[PDB]
Amino acid sequence: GDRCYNCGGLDHHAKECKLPPQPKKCHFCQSISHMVASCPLK
Amino acid sequence: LEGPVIDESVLSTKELLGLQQAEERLKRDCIDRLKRRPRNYPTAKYTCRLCDVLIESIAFAHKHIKEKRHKKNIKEKQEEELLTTLPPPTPSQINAVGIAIDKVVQEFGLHNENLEQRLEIKRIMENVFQHKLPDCSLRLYGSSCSRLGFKNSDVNIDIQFPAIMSQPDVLLLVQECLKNSDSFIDVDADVVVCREKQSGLLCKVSAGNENACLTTKHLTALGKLEPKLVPLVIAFRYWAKLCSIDRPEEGGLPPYVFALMAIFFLQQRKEPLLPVYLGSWIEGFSLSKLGNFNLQDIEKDVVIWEHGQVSLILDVKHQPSVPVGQLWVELLRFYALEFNLADLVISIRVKELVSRELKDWPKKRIAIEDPYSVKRNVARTLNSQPVFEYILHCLRTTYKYFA
RNA sequence: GGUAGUAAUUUGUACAGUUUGAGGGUCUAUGAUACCACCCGGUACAGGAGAUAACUGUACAGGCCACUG
Ligand SMILES: [Zn+2]
């Protein structure tokens, strides 16, 4: 239901995730450059 | 094996930035990536400073963070940082600390009259022993001669006997004399421990133990030349008594170990108030030959060493004098935070902090070096790590209360 | 006297793992019902990794006519 803390997997929980590490990306715009605070619309 | 633990080239720039963010998170948790692959355990990619624990992966770092030990260590580090920023005490605070130290000295401290009463006790001992052992004699040692122990501290007497006599036989016939004599009662074989019938103070008799008398005289001199030392040592001893660290049977440190630590602090201040028996001034002195050095005898405002003499008290141009309370707070800072008791020896003889590897010492808990017994660990009574942590917590709490 | 080893037993610390417990959720307006067909979002944050006791094994400090001369 909610995006996981690491690797951004909804169904996968953070503890359950066994995938290789992935960059943390802003969910609002899926942008690596812009975080939640720096969203272009904000 | 010479390659990096994590290769930036293999990872993309986006991946590299993500890994850098992950490592920043790990840094906030005190987890630091290994600069190079360890030869013994190259698998580990990170290390935890709090526990000094190798971590294979970032997820393992989070798992370690979940562990209670990491939380306890981070709490300890937070307490240390909080203590670090405490301001030095104001002049009123220093005066109050000095007044408290003086009050503690008056309440529980050995004075001249107590020494005269103890000399009277030794005189009674000499009177009763004279009939049977005219050759043998008695002297004060330990807390008695030092004047740095409490007034309630048990009498300590040492026997001088001829070379032909042997320490076990001498102690045995001394025990017999204590048996028959009416003056001494509740006598036990145990040193010989008894309860004085008239004075009412616990009494202990010893034979040989020349090193104890030497250290006691050295500390007596250090107290005499240094006036601030005695109040500081008495206050520190009172703190140990309150915390129960003074009691040996419970795993606490011996009493005079606290005085040794106090003199070590005074010697290691930024402006040294007391000198070191061994220093760079001595010709041929070295840490490798430190064991060869030894202390021979105590002179008035002078010391004797063999492999030459050193002054008991430093003689410097306009030597600084500061209040006793200021020295006490400085000692609290020196031992609670400034001094790592784990792996640094409290070596009075040498200015340099003797490493444990030099003496092949445990490196586990509080460690103190005897002035005359280089090979003896006077803190061996403290053999439990929980008790060691208890002493550190008590010292830090005392610093916080007084700062 | 020093070094280490040491069955049967005695303390202390955790818990890699098992399992029992209350709690935790918050977030409803966004319906799709009935045993006619059961599941989408707007109220609702941040860059934040989620237990304490009973239980199993494993190294580590002390105790033990343990243990040694
Ligand atoms: Zn995930």
Residue numbers in the entry:
A (entry chain B): 136 to 177
B (entry chain A): 199 to 388, 395 to 511, 535 to 630
From the manuscript:
Tumor-suppressor let-7 pre-microRNAs (miRNAs) are regulated by terminal uridylyltransferases TUT7 and TUT4 that either promote let-7 maturation by adding a single uridine nucleotide to the pre-miRNA 3′ end or mark them for degradation by the addition of multiple uridines. Oligo-uridylation is increased in cells by enhanced TUT7/4 expression and especially by the RNA-binding pluripotency factor LIN28A. TUT4 and TUT7 are multidomain enzymes whose specific targeting of RNAs makes use of three zinc fingers, combined with two copies of a nucleotidyltransferase domain (NTD), one inactive in the N-terminal half of the polypeptide (pseudo-NTD) and one active in the C-terminal half. Our structures reveal that pre-miRNAs engage the enzymes in fundamentally different ways depending on the presence of LIN28A, which clamps them onto the TUTs to enable processive 3′ oligo-uridylation.
In conformation I, most of the pre-let-7g could be resolved. In this conformation, the RNA stem interacts with the TUT7 LIM, while the let-7g 49AGGAG53 region coordinates with the zinc finger of TUT7 and ZK domain of LIN28A, forming a stable ternary complex. Based on the position of the RNA, this complex is believed to represent the initial step in oligo-uridylation, a ‘capture’ state in which the pre-let-7 has begun association with TUT7 but not yet completed its engagement. By contrast, comparison of TUT7 ternary conformations I and II finds no change in the relative positions of the palm and fingers subdomains of the LIM while the zinc finger binding the pre-let-7 stem moves substantially about a 16.8° rotation of the linking helix. The binding mode and overall conformation of the pre-let-7g miRNA appears to be remarkably consistent in all three LIN28A-containing complexes, apparently due to the LIM/LIN28A clasp and other key interfaces shown by mutational data to be the specific interactions responsible for ensuring efficient and processive oligo-uridylation.
